[PDB]
């Protein structure tokens, strides 16, 4: 399937400009590295109006600027031959949605400061090798798929493996594959079985369940090996990952009332508009969670508009409930 891009334009802190998701295929026009989300979509951050050209857009869309559970994920992005201008294979790792490892020039490269300083150069040399074997193995699985779906040309193959440690200490793990951005194969480590929603995917399911020693191995890695890696990195990034920075709330009007919150970490946050003094469920925009560029984050909530009514902005970060009074007669 193809997903039309969502666009938002905003500044790093109130007066750097950010053009910031949810799109597929990866074809899109400083710029950050290509990133992947849990739903197989991609997201980019371009920082200094904004023009975005995509396959789901006939005319290019224009937007102007006018004013605690921890996880470890690993993504693979495959691109059927030829290159189409994009690297055919890209693998990227994430802990708490923080970029760490980045392979495409075939090198094992860190994306964080605490990643490289805590790891000896032998570590990167060993995994840059693994990745080359993984790149080639991914290409072969791609060709095999195109022959199974009986079509050629541009197609994307995606892999996501990861685990997460709950605040209480409970753990889960997952392995999923996606063809052209749609869920393809889903692995359940409890029953050691693959789930297929497609007649074509069912073929690979019968091949992948035919190998028990692979299935048994995948259970171990998620449950045991992954978590150990997770906790190793957390101790490494104890500085940046365990910090808490408070949001700075700004309110504005243009009818519509805007509520901005700048530079807060962790990304877990809740914002809603209030009227005497209840939360308004109507004529409201979510805004989502956006990257600031500092490693911090910012979001926004708007409401379109009797007399003497009090409109105020509720924000809970550290909880720590914050309220700002925006408007009244």
């Amino acid at each position, epitope marked *: 399937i193809q997903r039309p891009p969502k666009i938002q334009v905003y500044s790093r802190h109130p007066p750097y400009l950010n053009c910031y998701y949810g799109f597929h295929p990866p074809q899109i026009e400083e710029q950050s590295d290509l990133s992947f989300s849990k739903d197989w979509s991609f997201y980019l951050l371009s920082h200094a109006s904004c023009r975005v050209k995509h396959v789901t857009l006939e005319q290019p869309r224009i937007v102007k600027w006018d004013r605690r559970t921890h996880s470890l994920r690993y993504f693979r992005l495959g691109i059927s031959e030829p290159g189409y201008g994009i690297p055919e294979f890209i693998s990227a790792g994430y802990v708490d949605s923080h970029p760490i490892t980045m392979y495409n020039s075939q090198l094992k490269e860190p994306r964080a400061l605490w990643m490289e300083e805590n790891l000896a150069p032998d570590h990167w*040399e*060993r*995994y840059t090798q693994l990745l080359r074997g993984w790149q*080639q*193995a991914f290409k072969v699985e791609l060709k095999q798929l195109q022959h199974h779906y009986n079509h050629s040309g541009f197609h994307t193959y995606q892999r996501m493996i990861g685990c997460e440690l709950l605040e209480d200490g409970s753990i889960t793990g997952f392995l999923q594959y996606a063809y052209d951005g749609q869920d393809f194969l889903i692995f359940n480590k409890d029953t050691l079985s693959w789930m297929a929603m497609d007649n074509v995917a069912d073929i690979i399911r019968r091949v992948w369940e035919a190998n028990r*020693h692979e299935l048994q191995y995948q259970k*171990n890695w998620l449950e045991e*090996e992954c978590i150990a890696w997770l906790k190793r990195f957390l101790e490494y990034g104890k500085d940046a990952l365990q910090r808490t920075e408070p949001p700075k709330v700004r309110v504005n009007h243009k009818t519509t009332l805007y509520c901005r919150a700048y530079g807060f970490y962790p990304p877990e946050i809740s914002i809603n508009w209030m009227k005497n003094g209840e939360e308004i469920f109507q004529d409201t925009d979510y805004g989502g969670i956006l990257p600031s560029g500092d490693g911090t984050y910012q979001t926004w909530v708007s409401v379109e508009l009797q007399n003497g009514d009090i409109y105020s902005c509720h924000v809970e970060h550290g909880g720590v409930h914050m309220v700002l009074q925006g408007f009244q007669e």
Partner: antibody
Amino acid sequence: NIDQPTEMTATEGAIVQINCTYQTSGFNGLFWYQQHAGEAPTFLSYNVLDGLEEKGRFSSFLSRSKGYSYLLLKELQMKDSASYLCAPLDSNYQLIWGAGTKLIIKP
Amino acid sequence: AGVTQTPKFRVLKTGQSMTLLCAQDMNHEYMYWYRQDPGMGLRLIHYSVGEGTTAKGEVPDGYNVSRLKKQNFLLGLESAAPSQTSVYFCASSYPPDGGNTIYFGEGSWLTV
């Protein structure tokens, strides 16, 4: 580091057990290999989860916590006389080979 | 199919340059070369992840390695030493993302 007996000796038709103790950084699996005298090593068993694995007369057990694994050979024949190599799969995917247990089958 | 390793025997005077072939009909990425000695487990001289790319293994002073095709993996020692007497094994397998068994070559005996 990895440790297994240097040599063992049993009579044909009996049942033998070869122990293997290993300490590695992580654990990605454990392989048992059979290498006859003056020949190439061949695959026997592979274990990851804690438990047993039976294939024919041969059976393999593994305990991840203890770092222990034994290889259970039942109904020993004369062709069973060889070296049995234990090697686990580490954390990074390098493979660490220990010097096998040489089994000598008496008729 | 299988993995083929030539030769199986060789006698060398010290200082001789000689090469050892290894070939897979099996269509794998990975290729290994090993050196087995008495009382010691296998020791990896060099490994090749994919065609054209190789890397130093556990013990490789004497040995320089190249990868022609996906099918061929060459070993070489340009200057022979008495300490290089051993029983070499070539070996090709799928990547260790597992459990992926490793397939072994019939071996090469060497003295010196």
